[PDB]
Amino acid sequence: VDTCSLASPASVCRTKHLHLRCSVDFTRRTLTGTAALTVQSQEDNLRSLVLDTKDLTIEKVVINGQEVKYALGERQSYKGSPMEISLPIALSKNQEIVIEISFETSPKSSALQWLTPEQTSGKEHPYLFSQCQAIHCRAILPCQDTPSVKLTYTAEVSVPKELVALMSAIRDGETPDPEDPSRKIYKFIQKVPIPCYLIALVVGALESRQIGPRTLVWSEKEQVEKSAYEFSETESMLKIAEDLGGPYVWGQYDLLVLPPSFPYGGMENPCLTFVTPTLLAGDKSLSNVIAHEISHSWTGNLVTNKTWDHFWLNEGHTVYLERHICGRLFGEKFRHFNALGGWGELQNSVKTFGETHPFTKLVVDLTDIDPDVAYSSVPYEKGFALLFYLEQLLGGPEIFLGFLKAYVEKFSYKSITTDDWKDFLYSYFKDKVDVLNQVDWNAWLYSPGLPPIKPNYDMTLTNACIALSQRWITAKEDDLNSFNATDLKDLSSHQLNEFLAQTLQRAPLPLGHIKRMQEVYNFNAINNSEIRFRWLRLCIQSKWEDAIPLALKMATEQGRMKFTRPLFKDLAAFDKSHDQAVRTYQEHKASMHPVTAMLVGKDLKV
Numbered sequence: 001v002d003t004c005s006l007a008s009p010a011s012v013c014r015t016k017h018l019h020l021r022c023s024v025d026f027t028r029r030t031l032t033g034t035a036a037l038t039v040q041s042q043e044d045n046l047r048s049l050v051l052d053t054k055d056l057t058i059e060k061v062v063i064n065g066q067e068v069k070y071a072l073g074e075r076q077s078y079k080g081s082p083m084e085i086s087l088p089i090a091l092s093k094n095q096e097i098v099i100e101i102s103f104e105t106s107p108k109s110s111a112l113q114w115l116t117p118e119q120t121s122g123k124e125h126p127y128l129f130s131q132c133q134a135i136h137c138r139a140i141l142p143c144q145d146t147p148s149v150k151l152t153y154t155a156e157v158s159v160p161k162e163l164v165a166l167m168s169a170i171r172d173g174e175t176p177d178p179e180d181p182s183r184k185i186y187k188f189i190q191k192v193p194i195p196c197y198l199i200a201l202v203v204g205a206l207e208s209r210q211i212g213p214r215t216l217v218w219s220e221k222e223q224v225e226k227s228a229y230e231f232s233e234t235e236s237m238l239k240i241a242e243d244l245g246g247p248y249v250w251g252q253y254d255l256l257v258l259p260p261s262f263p264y265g266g267m268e269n270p271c272l273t274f275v276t277p278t279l280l281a282g283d284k285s286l287s288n289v290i291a292h293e294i295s296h297s298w299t300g301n302l303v304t305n306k307t308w309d310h311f312w313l314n315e316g317h318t319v320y321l322e323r324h325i326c327g328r329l330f331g332e333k334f335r336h337f338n339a340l341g342g343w344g345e346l347q348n349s350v351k352t353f354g355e356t357h358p359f360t361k362l363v364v365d366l367t368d369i370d371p372d373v374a375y376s377s378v379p380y381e382k383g384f385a386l387l388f389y390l391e392q393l394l395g396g397p398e399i400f401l402g403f404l405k406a407y408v409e410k411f412s413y414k415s416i417t418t419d420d421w422k423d424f425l426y427s428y429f430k431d432k433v434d435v436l437n438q439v440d441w442n443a444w445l446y447s448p449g450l451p452p453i454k455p456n457y458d459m460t461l462t463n464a465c466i467a468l469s470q471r472w473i474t475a476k477e478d479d480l481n482s483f484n485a486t487d488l489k490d491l492s493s494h495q496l497n498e499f500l501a502q503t504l505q506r507a508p509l510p511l512g513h514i515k516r517m518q519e520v521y522n523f524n525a526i527n528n529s530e531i532r533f534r535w536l537r538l539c540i541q542s543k544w545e546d547a548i549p550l551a552l553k554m555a556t557e558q559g560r561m562k563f564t565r566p567l568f569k570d571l572a573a574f575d576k577s578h579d580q581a582v583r584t585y586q587e588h589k590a591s592m593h594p595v596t597a598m599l600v601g602k603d604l605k606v
């Protein structure tokens with residue numbers, strides 16, 4: 001049923017537990033060790049099984065202290081190579097065996113980026129971080145690389161004693177390596193069953209600062225103190241999340257601020273969220289990303305999508321919870337602001353993808369499609385639009401939040417499909433079934449382009465952005481002298497960002513407008529990467545050669561694909577910077593994140 005995994009489906013067998021013993025070698029850029037997988041059979045007379053692997057080196061497979069026959073199949077592009085294992089016994093239904101696999105990752109592992117000391121803040125020690133979603137755990141160790149199987153796990157990672165190792169699990173102790181005095185072993189334990197894509201590792205000279213009863217903030221010493229401040233409200237947001245979705249079951253909620261090449265804004269790794277360092281805007285304005293990763297602790301990590309065709313169930317509900325968290329902290333008016341802004345983003349994605357593009361469908365068919373290529377904000381906003389529309393259609397946020405909490409408890413620790421979600425919706429809202437039948441489910445779930453109906457959005461906080469953006473778009477020459485910094489006197493960082501987004505859509509603007517806009521607003525001096533990103537896009541799309549070097553620096557000084565990809569594609573579309581953009585990519589391609597370096601290459605057609 002999962003077209004992205006080459007392993008035995010959950011209907012044949014399930015991995016119950018993973019015991020990982022491994023060592024990080026920065027000299028060769030490999031993890032070597034063993035992966036003991038406790039696997040339970042789901043059928044009678046099970047005599048062999050298949051795992052997922054991608055660029056792994058297998059030494060042997062030991063079962064009950066004896067080596068066993070295994071075979072690796074031909075590689076299937078991004079899916080990797082399937083690994084068959086011959087069992088030393090035939091397992092009847094629900095019986096279990098432990099399989100010990102001696103493996104070693106490839107330096108080209110698509111799940112990891114190896115950073116040289118100069119690629120870090122401290123410039124003295126190397127760095128390693130993982131990114132498994134969607135199907136990259138197979139590039140770290142053999143497993144059923146599919147969200148349809150959930151497993152607990154325990155790990156022991158040997159690392160140079162000067163470094164620290166962290167995982168998506170509770171820290172369970174550290175000691176000097178008994179077989180190597182120059183190394184330390186960090187132990188971890190994750191008692192809540194998870195999909196293997198939530199497995200994460202990080203190794204580096206990490207410092208910590210406690211910002212809450214169950215929250216530490218991790219980063220290099222240069223950024224720890226800044227990050228502890230930027231995210232001071234995490235505990236504040238955890239209690240709101242708990243009130244909406246129920247108890248937080250993962251014990252610890254730590255935060256990890258990675259080096260600038262991290263490919264995404266955040267990764268909802270259990271116990272240790274990964275976030276881009278580009279959130280350090282200095283005013284906490286971009287902290288809603290933390291509210292997002294927090295919400296994933298219920299929608300996504302507790303209730304998980306069965307395949308990646310149903311990824312929208314994860315981010316769709318997560319965005320919904322996030323904007324309710326922000327609404328409880330800043331008012332319902334603010335919640336509608338983000339919802340409306342998100343609907344504007346959904347317009348941008350569709351315009352860029354195309355109204356008929358298959359990647360604008362809510363439920364996709366990733367058969368023979370690299371899930372990384374399908375990743376976009378469409379499942380985020382299109383998913384949220386559906387839930388918001390249902391919230392309004394079903395009687396308000398109070399009623400619908402009651403459904404969300406029940407939905408989470410109903411499928412806790414399980415993996416569901418869109419039909420599972422829809423089926424329980426009709427069960428929960430059995431009194432209003434006739435209202436649900438008014439919904440165009442076929443169009444919402446499987447038709448591409450923008451949804452069939454637009455929700456009702458409060459225009460209060462957005463009106464200020466619309467007035468100013470309209471003045472610039474419709475302004476002629478004689479109107480440019482009157483623009484002044486006072487236009488932003490009562491605008492927040494978010495409103496400033498929305499204004500740019502509103503202006504960005506109607507780009508390009510006359511060259512004089514862009515030059516005047518820099519004179520009066522000085523967007524070049526704003527550190528907020530969301531705002532800077534859009535201001536730069538507005539400049540390059542308007543053919544302003546002065547913004548070329550500023551955009552190349554931001555596209556390469558950080559690796560968040562949200563910014564790096566559009567900036568490059570825009571530089572490649574500008575005639576005056578096409579050559580410089582391509583040449584720049586070729587140079588940095590070798591030291592970019594593997595997933596990021598592959599995608600920009602496709603964007604650039606190199």
Ligand SMILES: Nc1cc(-c2ccc(Oc3ccc(Cl)cc3)cc2)[nH]n1
Nearest residue numbers: 134311359362371372374375378379
């Ligand atoms: N409009 C849409 C888009 C999708 C979609 C489904 C699966 C995907 O795989 C992933 C998920 C997360 C990451 Cl980090 C990388 C790849 C991406 C996107 N579903 N519906």
Ligand SMILES: [Zn+2]
Nearest residue numbers: 292296315318
């Ligand atoms: Zn997310």
